[PDB]
Design a protein around this motif. Structure first.
Motif, PDB file in Angstrom:
ATOM      1  N   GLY A  76       5.571   3.458 -10.544  1.00  0.00           N
ATOM      2  CA  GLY A  76       5.874   2.057 -10.737  1.00  0.00           C
ATOM      3  C   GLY A  76       4.745   1.208 -11.269  1.00  0.00           C
ATOM      4  N   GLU A  77       3.812   1.800 -12.038  1.00  0.00           N
ATOM      5  CA  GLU A  77       2.685   1.033 -12.562  1.00  0.00           C
ATOM      6  C   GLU A  77       3.152  -0.223 -13.284  1.00  0.00           C
ATOM      7  N   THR A  78       4.233  -0.120 -14.056  1.00  0.00           N
ATOM      8  CA  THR A  78       4.788  -1.263 -14.769  1.00  0.00           C
ATOM      9  C   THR A  78       6.104  -1.732 -14.157  1.00  0.00           C
ATOM     10  N   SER A  79       6.363  -1.379 -12.901  1.00  0.00           N
ATOM     11  CA  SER A  79       7.578  -1.773 -12.210  1.00  0.00           C
ATOM     12  C   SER A  79       7.238  -2.626 -10.994  1.00  0.00           C
ATOM     13  N   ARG A  80       8.240  -3.349 -10.488  1.00  0.00           N
ATOM     14  CA  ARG A  80       8.064  -4.033  -9.210  1.00  0.00           C
ATOM     15  C   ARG A  80       8.126  -3.089  -8.031  1.00  0.00           C
ATOM     16  N   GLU A  81       8.845  -1.988  -8.190  1.00  0.00           N
ATOM     17  CA  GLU A  81       8.994  -0.990  -7.135  1.00  0.00           C
ATOM     18  C   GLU A  81       7.896   0.043  -7.331  1.00  0.00           C
ATOM     19  N   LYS A  82       6.854  -0.055  -6.517  1.00  0.00           N
ATOM     20  CA  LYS A  82       5.663   0.764  -6.650  1.00  0.00           C
ATOM     21  C   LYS A  82       5.508   1.642  -5.418  1.00  0.00           C
ATOM     22  N   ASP A  83       5.087   2.877  -5.649  1.00  0.00           N
ATOM     23  CA  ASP A  83       4.734   3.800  -4.574  1.00  0.00           C
ATOM     24  C   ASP A  83       3.224   3.948  -4.560  1.00  0.00           C
ATOM     25  N   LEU A  84       2.630   3.745  -3.383  1.00  0.00           N
ATOM     26  CA  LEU A  84       1.186   3.773  -3.188  1.00  0.00           C
ATOM     27  C   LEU A  84       0.842   5.000  -2.360  1.00  0.00           C
ATOM     28  N   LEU A  85       0.033   5.895  -2.910  1.00  0.00           N
ATOM     29  CA  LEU A  85      -0.493   7.020  -2.141  1.00  0.00           C
ATOM     30  C   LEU A  85      -1.789   6.588  -1.473  1.00  0.00           C
ATOM     31  N   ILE A  86      -1.790   6.651  -0.148  1.00  0.00           N
ATOM     32  CA  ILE A  86      -2.952   6.403   0.682  1.00  0.00           C
ATOM     33  C   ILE A  86      -3.463   7.785   1.075  1.00  0.00           C
ATOM     34  N   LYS A  87      -4.579   8.209   0.501  1.00  0.00           N
ATOM     35  CA  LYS A  87      -5.006   9.599   0.633  1.00  0.00           C
ATOM     36  C   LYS A  87      -5.677   9.858   1.977  1.00  0.00           C
ATOM     37  N   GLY A  88      -5.360  11.008   2.578  1.00  0.00           N
ATOM     38  CA  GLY A  88      -6.114  11.447   3.731  1.00  0.00           C
ATOM     39  C   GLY A  88      -5.793  10.740   5.024  1.00  0.00           C
ATOM     40  N   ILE A  89      -4.599  10.180   5.156  1.00  0.00           N
ATOM     41  CA  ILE A  89      -4.233   9.389   6.317  1.00  0.00           C
ATOM     42  C   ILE A  89      -2.910   9.923   6.848  1.00  0.00           C
ATOM     43  N   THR A  90      -2.650   9.664   8.129  1.00  0.00           N
ATOM     44  CA  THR A  90      -1.375  10.012   8.747  1.00  0.00           C
ATOM     45  C   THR A  90      -0.416   8.831   8.782  1.00  0.00           C
ATOM     46  N   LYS A  91       0.864   9.164   8.943  1.00  0.00           N
ATOM     47  CA  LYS A  91       1.897   8.137   9.064  1.00  0.00           C
ATOM     48  C   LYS A  91       1.644   7.243  10.279  1.00  0.00           C
ATOM     49  N   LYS A  92       1.256   7.837  11.407  1.00  0.00           N
ATOM     50  CA  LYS A  92       0.968   7.060  12.611  1.00  0.00           C
ATOM     51  C   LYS A  92      -0.084   5.989  12.341  1.00  0.00           C
ATOM     52  N   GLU A  93      -1.161   6.347  11.630  1.00  0.00           N
ATOM     53  CA  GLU A  93      -2.216   5.377  11.330  1.00  0.00           C
ATOM     54  C   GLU A  93      -1.711   4.256  10.440  1.00  0.00           C
ATOM     55  N   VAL A  94      -0.948   4.609   9.403  1.00  0.00           N
ATOM     56  CA  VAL A  94      -0.430   3.613   8.474  1.00  0.00           C
ATOM     57  C   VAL A  94       0.488   2.626   9.192  1.00  0.00           C
ATOM     58  N   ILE A  95       1.374   3.134  10.047  1.00  0.00           N
ATOM     59  CA  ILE A  95       2.293   2.258  10.776  1.00  0.00           C
ATOM     60  C   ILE A  95       1.515   1.319  11.686  1.00  0.00           C
ATOM     61  N   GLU A  96       0.489   1.842  12.360  1.00  0.00           N
ATOM     62  CA  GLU A  96      -0.323   1.004  13.234  1.00  0.00           C
ATOM     63  C   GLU A  96      -0.948  -0.158  12.463  1.00  0.00           C
ATOM     64  N   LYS A  97      -1.474   0.107  11.261  1.00  0.00           N
ATOM     65  CA  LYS A  97      -2.088  -0.958  10.469  1.00  0.00           C
ATOM     66  C   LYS A  97      -1.051  -1.937   9.924  1.00  0.00           C
ATOM     67  N   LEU A  98       0.118  -1.440   9.506  1.00  0.00           N
ATOM     68  CA  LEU A  98       1.155  -2.332   8.987  1.00  0.00           C
ATOM     69  C   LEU A  98       1.720  -3.241  10.071  1.00  0.00           C
TER      70      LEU A  98
END
Ligand code: NA
Ligand code: NA
Length: 98
Positions: free
Chosen positions: A74-96
């Motif tokens: 989605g570089e030129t789209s509104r719907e973008k997927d972001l790869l956060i390297k080297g992290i777990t889902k649990k960590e990402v949810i905690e920060k969000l």
């Protein structure tokens, strides 16, 4: 009140966070969940031109997660997927959920 589980998946390389951007905002911030798209609604304080929304989006989430963030769809789209390297889902949810 926001549930991020439909907007995330954990891959071999990290976590892919799926967002939909609303540009022209006065502040870059998470505003809600687009349940029809499985994406986090993110206001972005940048115009939709010059890759400026991409730059602001990645600065914001790199600071939030404390990890490298690259745009993988989605570089030129509104719907973008972001790869956060080297992290777990649990960590990402905690920060969000802050
Ligand atoms: Na995978
Ligand atoms: Na941030």
């Amino acid at each position: 009140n926001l549930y991020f589980q439909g907007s995330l998946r954990e891959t071999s390389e990290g976590v892919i966070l799926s967002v939909i951007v609303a540009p022209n905002a006065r502040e870059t911030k998470i505003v809600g969940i687009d349940g029809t798209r499985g994406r986090v609604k993110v206001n972005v304080a940048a115009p939709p031109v010059k890759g400026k929304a991409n730059k602001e989006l990645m600065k914001f989430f790199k600071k939030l997660f404390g990890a490298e963030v690259v745009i993988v769809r989605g570089e030129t789209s509104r719907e973008k997927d972001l790869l956060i390297k080297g992290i777990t889902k649990k960590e990402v949810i905690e920060k969000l959920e802050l």
